């Protein structure tokens, strides 16, 4: 099982949740009681973005995040699998500009 940390501080955050290789992030934290945002649940938005500051995924049904976003850590939290063990900063969207 991979192991997500979750972190923000502002919004209280620091815990700790696992998830699957084949389950969203989000979905995975909603299972654990985390509540994280989101709107469209469908990758088309920036509503649940994140920054993956440790691991790795596979978010490629997102179609929101452009290569420079991408390369800055930014995930949408709907649509990613990890592949690893994570830290994920969230409410991100407000960090994108
Ligand atoms: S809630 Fe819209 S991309 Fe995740």
Redesign the pocket.
Same mark, same amino acid.
């Given at each position: 099982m991979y192991k997500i940390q979750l972190v923000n501080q502002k919004e209280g955050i620091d815990v700790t949740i696992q998830c699957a290789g084949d389950q969203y992030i989000?979905d995975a934290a909603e299972e654990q009681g985390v509540d994280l945002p989101?709107?469209?649940?469908?990758?088309?938005?920036? *509503? $649940?973005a994140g920054k993956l500051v440790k691991g790795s995924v596979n978010q490629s049904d997102?179609s929101?995040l452009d290569e420079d976003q991408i390369s800055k850590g930014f995930i949408? *939290? $709907?649509?990613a699998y990890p592949t690893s063990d994570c830290v994920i900063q969230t409410h991100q969207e407000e960090a994108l500009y």
């Open positions: 989000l989101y709107s469209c649940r469908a990758g088309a938005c920036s *509503t $649940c997102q929101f949408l *939290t $709907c649509v």
